[PDB]
Structure formats: C-alpha cells, structure tokens
C-alpha cells in the first residue's frame with residue numbers, strides 16, 4: 001500500500017493489534033512492517049491478520065530485537081520502500097516488586113528494552129525522516145511515565161525516562177516536520193503484567209514482612225483497578241490511529257481521561273507532597 | 286558523631302560542599318561518610334575539611350563506584366556505626382548532543398550511573414532504614430529531569446528516570462518512617478559531524494553557544510545547593526522535592542498547565558532558538 005508504518009513489539013497486545021488494524025484498514029492506505037523480537041512467535045499476528053483479512057502485501061513481519069543495535073540496523077534495510085512514514089515505538093517490559101527484591105539483570109533489561117530500545121530505534125529511523133522533512137514517530141506511553149506507582153519503581157523510571165527523551169527530541173524536531181507523540185495508556189488488558197510477578201517465596205525471602213505485606217495489598221488494589229478500568233488493545237489501537245491521522249499532532253494523546261484528575265493534582269502541587277499523599281492513601285489507604 | 290550520613294560523588298561540586306558543610310556543622314552532629322569514585326582525586330575534600338575545621342572522626346572517605354553492586358556492598362559494609370541516618374544519592378553524568386550522534390556506550394553509561402546507580406544504593410540501603418523505621422534519602426535531582434531539553438535527550442531521560450523512581454518509593458516508604466527528596470537543580474558551577482545531518486548540525490551548534498551563555502547567567506554555587514540539601518535535611522516534614530532556585534518555576538508551571546505537551550514544546554523551542 002502507501003503509508004509505510006513500522007512497529008516494534010508485535011507477537012501480542014498493542015503491537016499485534018495496532019499492526020493488524022492498520023494492515024486491515026479499509027482505505028488500504030498503509031503497508032505495515034510488524035516486527036517481532038523473535039520471529040518464531042508470529043503465528044498469533046498471522047491469524048489475527050487473516051482473522052481481519054489484511055489484503056496480501058499489507059503486512060510483512062521482520063525480526064527486531066530492540067536490545068540488538070545490529071538487529072535494528074538489519075530490520076531497516078529490509079524495508080523496501082526506502083522510507084518509514086510512521087515508526088511506532090512499542091516494545092516494552094514490565095517489572096513489579098519490592099525495590100530490593102528485583103534482579104540486577106532485570107533492572108537492566110527493563111531499561112535496555114524500555115529506554116535504550118527506543119533510543120536505538122529513533123537513532124536508526126529519525127535521521128532519514130529529518131532529511132525528508134516528513135515522518136511520524138509514535139511511542140506507547142504509560143500512566144506510569146506521568147505519575148509514580150508504588151512497587152513499580154524501575155518500570156516507572158523507564159516510562160518516566162521515555163517522556164524525558166521524547167519531549168526533549170520534540171523541541172528539536174519541531175522545525176523538521178517529524179512529529180513525535182507519546183500515547184499514554186492507563187491499564188491495558190494484555191498480559192503485559194502476566195509476564196511480571198515473582199512468587200511469594202521470592203518476594204518473601206527478598207524483603208521485610210511489613211513490605212511483603214504492602215505488596216499484596218497493592219497487588220489486590222491493582223487487580224481491582226485492572227478488572228475495573230483496563231482498556232482493550234483494540235481501543236488503544238484506535239488512539240495511535242487518531243494521533244496518526246491528526247495533521248498537527250500534540251506531544252501527548254490520552255487513551256483515557258481516567259487518571260486525568262490525578263495527573264492534574266500533580267502538576268498543581270510542585271512540592272509533590274500532595275500527590276504522594278493521595279497515591280499513598282489511594283493505594284494503601 | 287550521631288547522624289551518620291553516606292554521600293556519593295564527593296571529590297568536587299555538591300558532594301564536596303555537602304560533605305564538609307555537614308562535617309563542620311556547628312552542632313557537631315553528623316558523621317560523614319564522603320565516598321568517591323577514585324580516592325586518588327580526594328585532595329580538595331580533605332583540603333576543604335581540613336581548611337574547614339572538622340571534628341576529628343567527623344569525616345571519612347570510602348571508594349564507591351555506583352556502577353558496581355559489589356563496590357556498593359563494601360562501602361555499605363564499611364559504615365561502622367550500623368545505621369545510616371542520611372544516604373545522599375548524588376553521583377551523576379551529563380551526555381550532550383545530536384541523538385543519532387551519541388554512541389551506544391555513552392548512552393548506556395549515563396543510564397547506568399544516573400539511574401541504575403541510584404537503584405543500587407537504594408536497594409543497598411532502604412531495607413535497614415525500613416527496619417529502623419527511620420532514615421532520610423536526599424537525591425540530587427535536576428531541572429532537565431523536570432522538563433525536556435534539546436540536545437540532552439539521554440540525560441533528560443536519565444534524570445526523568447530518577448523522578449519516577451523516587452516518586453515511586455516516596456509513596457510506599459511513607460509508612461516506614463523513611464523520607465525521600467529531590468534537590469532539583471539548575472546549572473551549578475563545577476563523531477558529531479560524521480554522525481549527523483547539516484540542519485541538525487547547526488541547531489546543535491546554535492544550542493551550545495546559547496547554553497554556555499545561560500549557564501554562566503544561571504549557574505549557582507555548590508555552597509548554595511548544599512544549603513538546600515541541609516534545609517531539607519532539617520525538615521521535620523520533608524517534601525518530595527526542594528528547589529535550589531525559582532528561575533525555572535514559571536516554565537515548570539507552564540508544563541504542568543497543558544497536559545498535551547504542546548505549549549512547552551513551543552515555549553522551549555522558542556527559548557532556545559529565538560526566531
């Protein structure tokens with residue numbers, strides 16, 4: 001087709017869905033390069049695609065491991081049209097747990113994938129859009145990049161780190177015609193969190209009884225939030241899509257006004273003391 | 286003495302000035318574990334402290350490299366007292382430039398030192414505090430951790446990573462007696478050509494030039510920053526943030542005013558590039 005979109009992190013969730021929405025889109029507009037970290041895990045994208053009947057050629061998958069800077073370089077050359085209209089930054093990793101119980105390897109893959117991963121991504125793909133003076137970069141936000149969430153500290157820094165990188169490049173990209181937009185999402189129903197929790201034992205050995213106590217409390221709180229407010233991957237799909245569509249795009253797109261109030265309280269209290277109060281209260285009463 | 290403080294990056298700047306000020310406080314109450322990356326760079330500290338009259342024993346130095354879990358562990362192991370009343374997470378690194386011009390290694394070091402290094406201290410030190418149900422963590426934050434800066438993306442992400450990381454413990458730690466705080470700072474005294482394209486190149490150079498003017502306009506002294514740390518340190522109800530200046534408050538308030546990030550991007554693009 002004609003608008004060339006490239007998405008990172010597609011064997012499931014937001015990537016998968018964002019991918020097949022676009023490949024299936026009726027106006028047959030974009031050609032979607034669904035990249036997966038490990039190509040062996042692609043059957044789900046494929047059925048998805050068939051399930052919505054993406055016309056043949058509207059979608060190609062590639063292997064892209066955001067950890068691997070050659071892997072990135074590699075994907076790129078495999079893009080036939082010699083351009084990327086919209087480049088969607090989506091690969092992520094979660095990390096839930098008492099600060100002092102997280103593995104060193106794990107704090108480093110979260111920041112490698114979440115932060116270094118978007119960095120390596122944008123580095124490979126931004127240059128050429130700057131040249132053409134046209135280009136669109138979409139980056140999956142998280143409420144956790146705007147406000148701090150008990151027991152998700154490392155995850156929070158990466159989401160927070162992502163707004164640091166983005167609003168920073170946004171100021172420089174203005175005049176190029178390359179538009180950067182983070183897509184902040186609240187809880188999305190994808191099993192991003194299924195991949196996230198060690199077991200009681202781990203937690204147990206790893207931390208104090210008190211803290212061990214606060215974690216299940218959050219855990220039970222979060223679940224309830226989840227079950228009461230998560231959106232579907234297809235909903236969020238639609239949000240990249242609109243921002244994607246918009247002719248003069250803002251820096252942020254909300255997938256929900258859900259947390260809006262709370263994001264305001266923050267902004268309204270610079271000592272950051274009020275927000276802490278609430279969160280604390282809302283999470284542990 | 287009694288308030289045992291452990292502080293990172295102290296051979297120069299805020300670490301040096303915070304380390305000694307404390308050691309020489311007139312209430313002769315803090316014990317200062319000033320730690321450095323290379324002990325072969327510790328003259329000024331000792332010189333400062335010697336020149337400042339510090340109670341014999343009030344100051345000591347350990348070799349910590351926040352990039353090394355094992356180096357973090359031993360420093361910890363060297364705190365004879367057995368508690369840590371004030372842990373000062375201060376070690377940081379800048380990284381500047383055209384993003385597509387930054388090397389992978391520079392990028393990962395700034396994330397290792399600025400972000401993974403505060404994770405390490407915190408995990409070395411918060412459990413004991415939780416236990417005591419007492420302990421203050423002051424963290425050296427930045428302005429660039431508060432809002433985007435052209436040609437500083439990695440840095441800004443590291444510093445923005447700090448905020449969320451600290452903002453996150455701030456909520457949990459509440460109940461255990463521990464308090465966390467970032468001393469938000471402004472400027473403080475103390476391959477490109479090949480890797481980027483023309484337009485990006487000039488902006489880059491335009492940015493630099495203006496930026497060195499503003500630093501000299503803005504830059505405060507370490508002496509001043511340490512005074513904010515100290516205030517914070519005495520706050521019975523110490524907030525999550527403390528600011529060493531109000532130059533960046535307006536901009537701050539702007540940013541929090543338009544959630545879509547649009548105004549800021551404009552204001553700031555404007556500010557760095559006039560025209």
Ligand SMILES: NC(=O)c1ccc[n+]([C@@H]2O[C@H](COP(=O)([O-])OP(=O)(O)OC[C@H]3O[C@H](n4cnc5c(N)ncnc54)[C@H](O)[C@@H]3O)[C@@H](O)[C@H]2O)c1
Pocket residue numbers: 008009010011012013014015036037064065066067090091092093094113140141142143184185186187188189190191192193
């Ligand atoms: N699930 C939620 O509730 C939620 C909320 C807001 C934002 N997010 C963000 O959305 C994105 C996708 O999350 P999801 O909910 O779809 O979870 P998911 O795990 O279902 O999908 C994430 C995708 O990227 C991943 N990925 C991990 N490591 C990778 C690597 N090295 N290279 C390439 N890809 C890698 C996964 O393999 C998967 O393909 C991430 O940025 C996540 O942080 C998720």
Ligand SMILES: NC(=O)c1ccc[n+]([C@@H]2O[C@H](COP(=O)([O-])OP(=O)(O)OC[C@H]3O[C@H](n4cnc5c(N)ncnc54)[C@H](O)[C@@H]3O)[C@@H](O)[C@H]2O)c1
Pocket residue numbers: 293294295296297298299300320321322323349350351352375376377378379398402425426427428470471472473474475
């Ligand atoms: N100076 C400014 O204008 C300014 C602005 C805001 C925030 N900051 C922050 O101040 C902190 C550093 O103070 P500075 O800016 O005066 O820097 P500096 O370069 O003067 O500080 C040097 C000290 O930290 C170093 N260091 C580097 N890696 C280290 C590590 N892994 N462990 C321990 N020490 C390490 C050296 O050992 C030395 O001990 C960082 O958080 C920096 O981001 C400074």
